[PDB]
């Protein structure tokens, strides 16, 4: 009942946090980290431990469990 969206636009995932993406081909989730995130295309930019940067759509990537 007109609630929810009010100050900052939350992002499903933040800048530097530490994610899960599904590498296109491998179809697999693995470690990645947030750099930017495309709204033209919801595409957004991680990178990998072999430094390697691409485009996964907000679904495309997940995350898990907060630890620390």
Same mark, same amino acid.
């Given at each position: 009942? &007109?609630?929810?969206?009010? +100050?900052?636009?939350? %992002?499903?995932?933040?800048?530097? /946090?530490?994610? %899960?993406? %599904?590498?296109?081909? &491998?179809?697999?989730?693995? /470690?990645?980290?947030?750099? &930017?995130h495309? &709204?033209?295309?919801?595409?957004?930019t991680?990178?990998y *431990?072999? +430094?390697? /940067?691409?485009?996964? *759509? /907000?679904?495309?990537? *997940?995350?898990?469990?907060?630890? +620390?």
């Open positions: 009942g &007109s609630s929810g969206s009010s +100050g900052m636009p939350s %992002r499903k995932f933040a800048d530097g /946090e530490v994610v %899960r993406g %599904r590498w296109p081909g &491998s179809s697999l989730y693995y /470690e990645v980290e947030i750099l &930017s495309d &709204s033209t295309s919801q595409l957004y991680v990178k *431990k072999d +430094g390697t /940067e691409l485009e996964l *759509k /907000e679904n495309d990537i *997940k995350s898990g469990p907060s630890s +620390g």
